[PDB]
Design a protein around this ligand. Structure first.
Ligand SMILES: [Cl-]
Ligand SMILES: [F-]
Ligand SMILES: [F-]
Ligand SMILES: [Mg+2]
Ligand SMILES: [Mg+2]
Ligand SMILES: [Mg+2]
Ligand SMILES: [Mg+2]
Ligand SMILES: [Mg+2]
Ligand SMILES: [Mg+2]
Ligand SMILES: [Mg+2]
Ligand SMILES: [Mg+2]
Lengths: 308, 307
């Protein structure tokens, strides 16, 4: 039975780790041969979930073509967010909830994207479609992904489907979603103890917006000022990445997850397009974005329109 | 509120019938959809609309003057879609092709399955939403499946396609084999067709690596009947190659009873057809035994060969 690898994006988050584990479980329970893997270090929010539910971290890989011919992507599609040698393997399936870009196949495939708040909400439907029981620990990881992506049901990407899926999965997992979820989210927002290099990379994604090359990184914090007081250090590492990767823009979004507001720090030739996108004035490279917490819903679309 | 649903340029039975069927499902669920088309209805699709007493979808050239959002069926690539596709939001895609030249600003509902026909996916969607398929609509969906599968002979045809067709033929009240052989024959009637029509009726454009390609297909019950028009075919094909700056125009002339095709290849990259199929072009043509599917048996190997 031909082996496949399943993985999410570079700089993995809880949905990218847990949705890879869950979809590999659904495949293997149906008699196939899948291994969930990861493309970077597990963050502290995800580690809390894996520890709580007694599950192992997926194996770390740098490339896939040395191992397999076919892969499945979860929680992303764009080539520059994926594994370094993505061109060298066949993408058999994608299960995702993002915009589509920089993604091509030579052959027909199973591509399933729904504009819901979490990839795991889609995988929940797929377990039921295939008459596979969800084990307690698997449901716990799927719940963890929904809580992470929805910021405990506060994010504007959260839908009635995500809420319903979380209710089902919390019951299967044997946990109170609010109590568990608060503890998990707090494990991820712990950060006056992280390097600025980690801050700008632990939830960074690259994009192309028209002709322009862009990186958008986000930090969950419970306090904007204990990030903002490090602006000189943040500018030094961000400017280095801008030069090395030839970026037109690096946008750091520092989100207060308990107030649902964000501070932007924008560096690069196209920093003024942030002003157009959010109707905002950059002063000393920053601006407050009130209400903005979602990169896929509230940052990527307007930044595209402003840049074009 | 108002949305348009449509398939590819040079519409086939799946593109017309899946647009009609998905609009029906949206409308039965309380939404506001109209199915439209991007080109003239072919003789196969016309046979189906006459048989099931259904009108042809309204022909449109642009969408942005009418609506803000659209739904694509049976395609995704921009160059196969409506000319002003960049000026509207794509809300959903239901499809069974490779993905390319397709980008959105926002998340969307994208549902592609590597099955034999878009209508096979829509059949599942009616069930997921608990909506009854009307007799006339089931016949159109059936027509789409028979068309894309060449009466269950194409290698794209899966067990899901066969199962869908069996349910829909029962709802439609027809024998699939008898109706299907007749419908397919209606599209294989090339007697009143100009060579301009022959190379455009079922033509699709692609970019394969960095090479610009057009692949047209024609259904026949006698390859040699179209092969005797080769000089006239080469005239119109070469005109297209020049006008569109193509690296390759490939005409695939398919014997729908024998499951073989004759290739006619014109353009700088014609020799890549020899590599893709392990054949030798003689006077610009080569027999491709077993080859009937563009999405499964032509596009992938041509892509490899041209890389
Ligand atoms: Cl009519
Ligand atoms: F995610
Ligand atoms: F089709
Ligand atoms: Mg993610
Ligand atoms: Mg996600
Ligand atoms: Mg996430
Ligand atoms: Mg995120
Ligand atoms: Mg079609
Ligand atoms: Mg089709
Ligand atoms: Mg077709
Ligand atoms: Mg076709």
């Amino acid at each position: 039975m031909e082996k496949i690898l399943i993985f999410g994006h570079q700089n993995p988050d809880t949905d990218t780790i847990c949705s890879a584990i869950a979809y590999a479980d659904l495949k293997n329970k149906l008699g196939f041969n899948a291994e969930p893997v990861r493309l970077g270090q597990v963050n502290g929010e995800t580690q809390y979930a894996l520890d709580y539910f007694k599950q192992e971290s997926p194996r770390l890989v740098e490339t896939a073509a040395n191992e397999v011919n076919g892969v499945i992507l979860v929680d992303h599609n764009e080539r520059q967010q994926s594994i370094k040698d993505i061109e060298e393997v066949q993408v058999l399936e994608v299960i995702d909830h993002h915009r589509i870009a920089n993604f091509e196949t030579a052959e027909p495939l199973y591509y399933r994207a729904e504009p819901v708040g979490c990839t795991a909400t889609i995988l929940n439907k797929m377990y039921k479609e295939n008459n596979v029981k969800i084990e307690k620990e698997i449901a716990g990881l799927m719940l963890s992904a929904i809580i992470s992506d929805s910021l405990l049901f506060k994010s504007p990407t959260c839908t009635d489907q995500d809420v319903a899926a979380a209710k089902e999965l919390a019951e299967i997992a044997g946990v109170d979603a609010e109590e568990y979820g608060l503890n998990m989210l707090k494990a991820g927002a712990d950060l006056s103890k992280k390097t600025v290099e980690e801050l700008i990379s632990l939830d960074a994604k690259e994009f192309t917006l028209g002709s322009k090359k862009v990186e958008i990184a986000q930090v969950n914090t419970v306090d904007i000022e204990d990030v903002k007081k490090r602006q000189a250090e943040l500018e030094a590492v961000i400017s280095k990445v801008v030069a090395e990767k030839n970026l037109d823009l690096f946008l750091l979004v520092i989100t207060d997850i308990l107030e649902n507001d964000s501070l932007a720090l924008a560096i690069g030739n196209e920093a003024a397009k942030v002003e157009k996108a959010f109707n905002v004035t950059l002063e000393n490279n920053t601006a407050l974005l009130k209400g903005v917490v979602s990169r896929k819903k509230q940052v990527v679309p307007v930044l595209t329109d402003a840049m074009a």
